[PDB]
Amino acid sequence: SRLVVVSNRIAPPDSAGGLAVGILGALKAAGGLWFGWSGETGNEDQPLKKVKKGNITWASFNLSEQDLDEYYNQFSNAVLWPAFHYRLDLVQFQRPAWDGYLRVNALLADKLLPLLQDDDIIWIHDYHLLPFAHELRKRGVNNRIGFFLHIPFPTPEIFNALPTYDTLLEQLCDYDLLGFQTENDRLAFLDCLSNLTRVTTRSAKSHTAWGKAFRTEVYPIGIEPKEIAKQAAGPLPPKLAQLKAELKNVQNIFSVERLDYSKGLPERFLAYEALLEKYPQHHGKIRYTQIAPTSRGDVQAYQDIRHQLENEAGRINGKYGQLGWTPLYYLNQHFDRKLLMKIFRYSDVGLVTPLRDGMNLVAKEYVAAQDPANPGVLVLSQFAGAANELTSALIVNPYDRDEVAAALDRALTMSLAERISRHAEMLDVIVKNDINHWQECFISDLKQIVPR
Amino acid sequence: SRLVVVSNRIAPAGGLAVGILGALKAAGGLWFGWSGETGNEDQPLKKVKKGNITWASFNLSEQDLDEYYNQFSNAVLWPAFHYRLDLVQFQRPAWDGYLRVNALLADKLLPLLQDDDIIWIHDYHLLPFAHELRKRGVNNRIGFFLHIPFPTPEIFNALPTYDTLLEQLCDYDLLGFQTENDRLAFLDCLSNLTRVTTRSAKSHTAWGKAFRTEVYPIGIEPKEIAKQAAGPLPPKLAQLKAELKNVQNIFSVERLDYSKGLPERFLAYEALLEKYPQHHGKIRYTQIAPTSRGDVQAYQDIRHQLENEAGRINGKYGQLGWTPLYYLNQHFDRKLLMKIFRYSDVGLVTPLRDGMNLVAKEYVAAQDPANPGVLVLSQFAGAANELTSALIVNPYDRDEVAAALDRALTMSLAERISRHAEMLDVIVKNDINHWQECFISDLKQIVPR
Amino acid sequence: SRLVVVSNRIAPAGGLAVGILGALKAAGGLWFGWSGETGNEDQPLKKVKKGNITWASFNLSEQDLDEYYNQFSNAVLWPAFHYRLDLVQFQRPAWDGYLRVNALLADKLLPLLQDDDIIWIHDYHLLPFAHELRKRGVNNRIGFFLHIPFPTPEIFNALPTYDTLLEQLCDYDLLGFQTENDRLAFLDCLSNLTRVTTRSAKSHTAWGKAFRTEVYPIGIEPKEIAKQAAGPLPPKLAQLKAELKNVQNIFSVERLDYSKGLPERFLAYEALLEKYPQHHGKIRYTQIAPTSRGDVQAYQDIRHQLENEAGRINGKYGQLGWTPLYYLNQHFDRKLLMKIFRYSDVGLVTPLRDGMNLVAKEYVAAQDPANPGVLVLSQFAGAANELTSALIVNPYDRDEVAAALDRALTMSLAERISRHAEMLDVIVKNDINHWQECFISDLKQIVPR
Amino acid sequence: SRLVVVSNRIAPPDSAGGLAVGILGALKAAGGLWFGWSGETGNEDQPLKKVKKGNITWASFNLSEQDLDEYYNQFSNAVLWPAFHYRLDLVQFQRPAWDGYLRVNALLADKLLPLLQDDDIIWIHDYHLLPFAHELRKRGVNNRIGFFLHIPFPTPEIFNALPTYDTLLEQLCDYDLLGFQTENDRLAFLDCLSNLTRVTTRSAKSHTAWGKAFRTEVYPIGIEPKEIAKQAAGPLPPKLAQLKAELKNVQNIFSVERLDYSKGLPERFLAYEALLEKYPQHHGKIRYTQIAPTSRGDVQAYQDIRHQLENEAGRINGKYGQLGWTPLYYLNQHFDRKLLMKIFRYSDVGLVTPLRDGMNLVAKEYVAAQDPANPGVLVLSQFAGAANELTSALIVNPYDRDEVAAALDRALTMSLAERISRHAEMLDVIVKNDINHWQECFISDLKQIVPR
Numbered sequence A, D: 001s002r003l004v005v006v007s008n009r010i011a012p013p014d015s016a017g018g019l020a021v022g023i024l025g026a027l028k029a030a031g032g033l034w035f036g037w038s039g040e041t042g043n044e045d046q047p048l049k050k051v052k053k054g055n056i057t058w059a060s061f062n063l064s065e066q067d068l069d070e071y072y073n074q075f076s077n078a079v080l081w082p083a084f085h086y087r088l089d090l091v092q093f094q095r096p097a098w099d100g101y102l103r104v105n106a107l108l109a110d111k112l113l114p115l116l117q118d119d120d121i122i123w124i125h126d127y128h129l130l131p132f133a134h135e136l137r138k139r140g141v142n143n144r145i146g147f148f149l150h151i152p153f154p155t156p157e158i159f160n161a162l163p164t165y166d167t168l169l170e171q172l173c174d175y176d177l178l179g180f181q182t183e184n185d186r187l188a189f190l191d192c193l194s195n196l197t198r199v200t201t202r203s204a205k206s207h208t209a210w211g212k213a214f215r216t217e218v219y220p221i222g223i224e225p226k227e228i229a230k231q232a233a234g235p236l237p238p239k240l241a242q243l244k245a246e247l248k249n250v251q252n253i254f255s256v257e258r259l260d261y262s263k264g265l266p267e268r269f270l271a272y273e274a275l276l277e278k279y280p281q282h283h284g285k286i287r288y289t290q291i292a293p294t295s296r297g298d299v300q301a302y303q304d305i306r307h308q309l310e311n312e313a314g315r316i317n318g319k320y321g322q323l324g325w326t327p328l329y330y331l332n333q334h335f336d337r338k339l340l341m342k343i344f345r346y347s348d349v350g351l352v353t354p355l356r357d358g359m360n361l362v363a364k365e366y367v368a369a370q371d372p373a374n375p376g377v378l379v380l381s382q383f384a385g386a387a388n389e390l391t392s393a394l395i396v397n398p399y400d401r402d403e404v405a406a407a408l409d410r411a412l413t414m415s416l417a418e419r420i421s422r423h424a425e426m427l428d429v430i431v432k433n434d435i436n437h438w439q440e441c442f443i444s445d446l447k448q449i450v451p452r
Numbered sequence B, C: 001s002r003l004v005v006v007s008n009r010i011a012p013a014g015g016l017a018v019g020i021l022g023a024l025k026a027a028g029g030l031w032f033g034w035s036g037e038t039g040n041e042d043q044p045l046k047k048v049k050k051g052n053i054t055w056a057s058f059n060l061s062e063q064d065l066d067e068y069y070n071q072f073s074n075a076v077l078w079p080a081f082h083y084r085l086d087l088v089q090f091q092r093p094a095w096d097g098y099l100r101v102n103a104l105l106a107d108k109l110l111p112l113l114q115d116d117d118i119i120w121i122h123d124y125h126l127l128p129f130a131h132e133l134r135k136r137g138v139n140n141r142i143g144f145f146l147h148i149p150f151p152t153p154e155i156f157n158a159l160p161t162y163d164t165l166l167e168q169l170c171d172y173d174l175l176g177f178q179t180e181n182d183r184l185a186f187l188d189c190l191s192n193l194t195r196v197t198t199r200s201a202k203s204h205t206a207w208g209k210a211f212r213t214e215v216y217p218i219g220i221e222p223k224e225i226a227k228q229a230a231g232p233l234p235p236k237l238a239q240l241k242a243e244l245k246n247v248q249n250i251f252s253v254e255r256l257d258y259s260k261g262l263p264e265r266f267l268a269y270e271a272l273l274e275k276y277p278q279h280h281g282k283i284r285y286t287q288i289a290p291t292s293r294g295d296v297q298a299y300q301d302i303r304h305q306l307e308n309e310a311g312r313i314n315g316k317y318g319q320l321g322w323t324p325l326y327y328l329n330q331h332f333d334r335k336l337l338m339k340i341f342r343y344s345d346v347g348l349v350t351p352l353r354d355g356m357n358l359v360a361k362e363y364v365a366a367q368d369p370a371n372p373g374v375l376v377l378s379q380f381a382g383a384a385n386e387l388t389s390a391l392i393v394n395p396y397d398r399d400e401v402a403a404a405l406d407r408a409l410t411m412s413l414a415e416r417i418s419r420h421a422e423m424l425d426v427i428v429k430n431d432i433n434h435w436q437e438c439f440i441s442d443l444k445q446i447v448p449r
Ligand SMILES: O=c1ccn([C@@H]2O[C@H](COP(=O)(O)OP(=O)(O)O[C@H]3O[C@H](CO)[C@@H](O)[C@H](O)[C@H]3O)[C@@H](O)[C@H]2O)c(=O)[nH]1
Pocket: A017, A018, A019, A150, A151, A221, A256, A257, A258, A291, A292, A293, A333, A334, A335, A336, A337, A340, A357, A358, A359, A360, A361, A362, A363, A365, A385
């Protein structure tokens, strides 16, 4: 019956993101509890902050500065994030970080225990909480527990470099259900596990390792098509309505993401440079806007990527700019999601070219936001999880800047008929694998496990 | 009475060049000067004749270039004279090459010289030139003009070879500077080393060598600036004149070098954006700066920093439909730049140190006197001694620069008119023609040794 | 039954070269290979003959060099194959040039080929070489040996041209790798693209093309290493042998490249100094690393960082009479390096990724078996599959590396002996002679198409 | 009668530096009070911390983090220090910094007032307290107040770039007595004042500006020769005694200072490089040791110079180093002054080549520390204040690295007879202008002013 969801952050009643709509859909159906970090530092030793509306309860706690630094800044974001995105060169393994990561998981488990009921189903989200099922088991919780990894799971040759990889695998197997964005992530997890210990598998997705039974499954996260199309078709704020009108004979190429090195933003700028260099006929007639709010700015590698991006914006505009034409608009700013939907609708090209992305919701949002009668074009990296389902996109390899540039040109000149075709085929896939479908499949699978 | 001018680079228009040509057109004579590469190391000089002027040019070796021009002149003299001892990179092989090429240049000029010539030498690459001429017996009236600042003793005396440089400069009969403070700095430097006697106004003796000093602040040709500024824009440029009906333009153009204080400028615009949010969406700062002298130690670390700062500032303050800062690392025709000046509401000229800065004067000569923009000018620019009606600022105080910018953007037509008319009267009175004529007339008056 | 070897750079000694020479001395034949500059772009190949071996070399254009060797091979293939996709810099002009030069090289070799030849191609610059040979009708047995790692699909498939590279590699009759995991990675890459059939042990079909794969971990010549190591030091070098009676020496030598994890190494020594203060004044870490391939994008940003880190670490932990870290950016003779190995108490070989790493094997072959040092070896070095008795570490865990270092410095003679004797037996059994003979014998067994 | 001294830091009874011995000499003679910052951040609102031994009292206060940042880190060390050392390119003028600088001076004056007596003579030290006389006057203190500037005072063309230069001059004239290290500093101050306002001068050193009367004077700070020679002749700690013996056929070149950009440390390393390059006969037979403890490490320009120095040490040793010979020993470490005296005595060459230095006590310490019967050689920059009196040093221009290298070679090979001559002439100058002489002259001059 009751659903408990915990994740690193939680969204209480009063700007609803992609994951939030999914969690809330699940919680609204079952009723239950959403538990996680308040996003605040300091004053940890105040009671849990609780809200209750109808059937759902929201609960949060603060974290100390040390715990945040070792758990979130260091281990999560400077070890697991770079490794799981195939950047060994960036991980900063240190023992205190690893100890902090275990400490906060144990802390969270301790806070959570009194709030649990015997029949609860428990859903844990993301790489911050890899050890969490294990911490629950050692505290006597026998409940069904599922995990969803929102990011890629790396192959053995990368995963096995983590000094702590073996402990991570052992603890992952304390979940009854492990969910991944793509088939390759699930396979990679099983591949790392099989390299470490004997695994017994039945029908691809049911396993035993060290005598522990667990299932695996793929649930590619999605969007709410009806909500996005509503938001997207709504009027722009007055100042932005004015701008849309002023851009009548300007084609807009648009990108938005957190400012992360996984997103390949410099490589993208270089591709835009390549478009400007080799297709001069677009000069003065196109614009590329990149919205990239700072993310995890306490972490050196994130400051580094931001500085690199600032330089490239200045260099490209410095070289291809004219007195009355700025080629590249770079905004280190966060935009409301409801507004982004409107901006996607008026953008001729959506450019989503990450080097590695668990899924990438921006790509699904962009084509849901389109006017089906006059849709823009998605240019999508083959390394985004989304590329598995959005095969009608212009799929590209961001390591070949000339290919990305060619695809940008192709997108800018595509006929109405072909834009519609490609759009309708993508939209059909994302309407058939909804965010509702995504949470319903996960919860249905979780309810099926016979608890220990 | 022939005039022989020599200067670094030549021209078979510009600003200094109109002054040299004007001086040559009056007297008749010869312009003698260098031209980069090599094209041909061991070749006869280029003797090309118009009517009164005879034009002669010559090459160089890549070894001479590096020690002479790329090293001593531009890695010791230029940074030191602009108050940056931290940027001097003295090596004796380069001092030696500096003297070598001066002596070479002197060797090629000697044959082309006539007894009754008056001779006029330009700028810091040729501080030693009159000494090398004296060593060859030439007794002619020779004058020097220094285009950059002359530093105070506490800076100049750090130069390992300051005392030679000082002995050599006193072989000129006349030494011209852009400001009184440059003239005084030189005299103070010379006074710290040796006894100098001033028996009458601006007339000196040191080590028994007689010489004069004087101030000739280089000027502009106001008519031609106004003519060029007034002309029709290229089509694509008149597409953003009435597109920015409600957007005011702050404008700067210069060479990339450490003396111009470009990052400091970006910081000042940031401070304007930060503390005066009224202006968002309604102003723009455009900076043009073509790369220069990235050959030795490459000041090009400043290009990189400007790229970063444009990206940073735009990323913070920009909007989907508004880019606060336009940074262009591109070459623009002089003619077009004159038109941009005219259509820009604010001229931002804030070097950290500048001999004169002709851009400040061009900006106000290019203005429509009926509806002129405002000049914001650094007090460390030599032009600030005369352009007293400019908004004068200390670039080390970015908030003062921002407040000036705010003041310039809100200034009434009446005040914009009287400030501009005031500056303009000054530039018309001391034009490039007046400048050259004053220097020549003074040089002519000297009795040769 | 002739052997034709081709490899990048040649030699009219080393390690691979003794293997190629040994294989050529047995069969007789020809070594065919490149040599940098140009010296002469359009010149006949260099046909120099000993007795059984005939040696042929040729030049190249600076455009071919940059796209072929400086770009695709070393800016795409090398970083990708060492698990650094973030360092790949793919441009199609360089892919094209990569194919161009392979085809050129194939054109010059064709005439020098004989019907009954066996052919042996070395390393990643020539992945396409057997395809270009097939296009010219040569049906000979051709084998390939890859000296560097072959990456897993998740890395390899990122290469814009991975599928061509895969089709081309299957034109070799035999493909040799340094480890089982490289062999498996290749097969997994090929399996992701197309159906491959393995009807019998290590024998495959793909697109109807038959080929074999196998593991030949490159080895050393143990006798000559021991001989060179045992010889008398140059005087000045035997001045610090018994000056450091009470000071133990940790020693590493390699090329500067990102795969070697040099800054990570310095960090590990710091962690040793930080957490084991017993060792202060009593140990030293010496790193030799000559600069390499600073031509394109210049990994030389690592030189700079090592300079910084040596200065930082010594500045923190040094004393008036003790320098913890000796970093030398200098070339040392092979002979001398063998002697340094022998007199060093700890051999530190901790690359982030390495095909094999011959230094690990040299270090233990050079040891006095009566009083040998300890090898600390990265698990990411191909040599770690065989040198199981080494102290095996994860360089991503600097404290584990430090603890290994501490363990190596305190290790009893008895344990130092059995670990070394164990590693040494392995290197003697699989020596450079065994390696070449195994590859040749397998290549000979194939029935030509 | 009673002397009050205030300075940014104070030295209570229980390692006595150069300035401290001078202050304490003065205080011991008059009796009185030494007042200043404790060096501690936080908990400002605890009572003044007071000690009393015989006739002297020591008093200190803590400063808040904000006050420290704006007063000490920002205005003092990132504006006044770079400007007064001719580095306009490094000053970081911002209004809040300037306001903080005034605030802390006012704060110090407020703390100090109740502790004053009508007949006190008051001695203020250094650029942190330029406004301090002024703050005292506005609080009704008529006492004789003297100031000593320990660093250079820059010419008008540099001074006048400080946005706040005019206020600084006005406030300086509230002192009855202003003391400088050299005649050029005093002249430079008067030059800046004369450029701003009409100054009336009698007999060079007695002035009026804005109707305010004040005197100027030069007091070049010095050393305690008898104490230094005692310390220097004492036995080395056992481990260092061992090292001295092991270096019998090695010539030592030695330098020590705070790691400051005023000291020209990179330029010095470059000169050592030049010695190694052009005089190879010293290879394996000399060593250069540079001790350079971090100073003001919170300030970006100080982190920058430290990083530059680390790189150059690694590069030089990387290039000229041998398996059993390290050319350059760099220690980012602070050494006790009593020990340094011993190290100076066993060093063949003292290398003191700052780009700009008010005086530089290390240079005077080095020759006081020498065995007069076998003295080492001082190589001294012409830009140290000390060069005015130590004319028998090998005087050099650090902007000419080949000249410094030549002087190093000359020093390394100098005959006993010439070493003795040069040493004895320097020692005579520093024994005749003692630290005792320095404080006695200052106090004698201060007692002479007729208080307002
Ligand atoms: O200014 C901004 C920037 C982004 N977004 C929204 O933020 C979300 C970004 O999600 P996504 O594009 O998926 O990227 P990620 O931030 O990286 O989040 C991680 O989690 C998502 C959920 O599983 C996966 O799709 C990703 O691959 C995973 O890296 C989208 O809904 C955006 O519309 C905003 O609302 N405002």
